[PDB]
Design an enzyme around this catalytic site. Structure first.
Site, PDB file in Angstrom:
ATOM      1  N   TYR A  17      26.459   8.996 -12.317  1.00 18.69           N
ATOM      2  CA  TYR A  17      25.447  10.047 -12.316  1.00 18.69           C
ATOM      3  C   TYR A  17      24.204   9.760 -13.144  1.00 18.69           C
ATOM      4  O   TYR A  17      23.239  10.521 -13.090  1.00 18.69           O
ATOM      5  CB  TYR A  17      26.057  11.361 -12.806  1.00 18.69           C
ATOM      6  CG  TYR A  17      27.302  11.792 -12.064  1.00 18.69           C
ATOM      7  CD1 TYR A  17      28.575  11.499 -12.561  1.00 18.69           C
ATOM      8  CD2 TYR A  17      27.210  12.503 -10.871  1.00 18.69           C
ATOM      9  CE1 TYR A  17      29.726  11.908 -11.884  1.00 18.69           C
ATOM     10  CE2 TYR A  17      28.345  12.915 -10.190  1.00 18.69           C
ATOM     11  CZ  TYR A  17      29.599  12.616 -10.699  1.00 18.69           C
ATOM     12  OH  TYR A  17      30.717  13.025 -10.009  1.00 18.69           O
ATOM     13  N   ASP A  95      17.379  20.276 -15.165  1.00 19.11           N
ATOM     14  CA  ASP A  95      16.566  20.122 -13.973  1.00 19.11           C
ATOM     15  C   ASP A  95      16.420  21.519 -13.387  1.00 19.11           C
ATOM     16  O   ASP A  95      17.327  22.333 -13.518  1.00 19.11           O
ATOM     17  CB  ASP A  95      17.261  19.187 -12.980  1.00 19.11           C
ATOM     18  CG  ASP A  95      18.755  19.398 -12.938  1.00 19.11           C
ATOM     19  OD1 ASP A  95      19.404  19.198 -13.991  1.00 19.11           O
ATOM     20  OD2 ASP A  95      19.276  19.777 -11.860  1.00 19.11           O
ATOM     21  N   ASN A 116      24.715  24.951 -12.330  1.00 19.22           N
ATOM     22  CA  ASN A 116      26.103  25.235 -12.714  1.00 19.22           C
ATOM     23  C   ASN A 116      26.418  24.932 -14.179  1.00 19.22           C
ATOM     24  O   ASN A 116      27.349  25.504 -14.754  1.00 19.22           O
ATOM     25  CB  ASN A 116      27.079  24.492 -11.780  1.00 19.22           C
ATOM     26  CG  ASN A 116      27.255  23.011 -12.119  1.00 19.22           C
ATOM     27  OD1 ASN A 116      28.094  22.624 -12.913  1.00 19.22           O
ATOM     28  ND2 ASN A 116      26.419  22.165 -11.488  1.00 19.22           N
TER      29      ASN A 116
END
Length: 191
Positions: A17, A95, A116
């Site tokens: 990631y 973000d 989330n």
């Protein structure tokens, strides 16, 4: 006798990631860490990666969950308790879909959008009243879903401007800590 600011960068673990949109929080955090001059070391009583030092003229605890988004709250909550940091003294970098790419906005409280990780943090703290350094990634290519979108890498057209965007976010963060919300967001915001 010092009573700090907790700066949290959001992102997921792992090579896998390291370059996704959902990992902007981590990038900014790595830059701040570079500005403080030390590397991240695991905070054993919380499990998160923690860097401590001076930043923008004050005492700062820089952190990166070593746990996944869905669960960032389980380390950020304890970490905040560990240093007796009030919600108002917590700053989260993430973000943001609801804002165009390269645009940076500062906010205190409010909705967490589709993030989330923010959801997790607020649920752990028991409040949404913490500062957010929102880094714009923009809305989706027509039908691609938000969550999946932020888990993809930046298009190469984006990839080029990302390094600049991250430095600016890091500057806006120091600006927030140094001057306060209103002054900082008046310097950072324009139609």
């Amino acid at each position: 006798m010092a009573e700090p600011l907790l700066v949290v960068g959001l992102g997921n673990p792992g090579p896998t990631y390291a370059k996704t949109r959902h990992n902007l929080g981590f990038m900014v955090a790595d830059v701040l860490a570079g500005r403080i001059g030390s590397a991240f070391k695991v905070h054993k009583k919380s499990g998160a990666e923690v860097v401590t030092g001076r930043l923008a003229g004050t005492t700062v605890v820089l952190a990166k969950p070593r746990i996944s988004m869905n669960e960032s709250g389980r380390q950020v909550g304890p970490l905040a308790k560990f240093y007796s940091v009030p919600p108002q003294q917590i700053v989260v970098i993430h973000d943001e879909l609801d804002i165009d790419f390269g645009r940076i906005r500062l906010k205190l409280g409010g909705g967490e959008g589709g993030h989330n990780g923010l959801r997790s943090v607020a649920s752990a703290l028991g409040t949404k009243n913490f500062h957010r350094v929102r880094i714009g990634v923009g809305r989706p290519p027509g039908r691609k879903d938000p969550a999946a979108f932020v888990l993809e890498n930046f298009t190469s057209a984006e990839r080029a401007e990302v390094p600049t965007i991250v430095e600016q976010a890091a500057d806006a963060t120091e600006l927030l800590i140094a001057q306060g919300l209103e002054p900082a967001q008046n310097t950072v915001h324009a139609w």
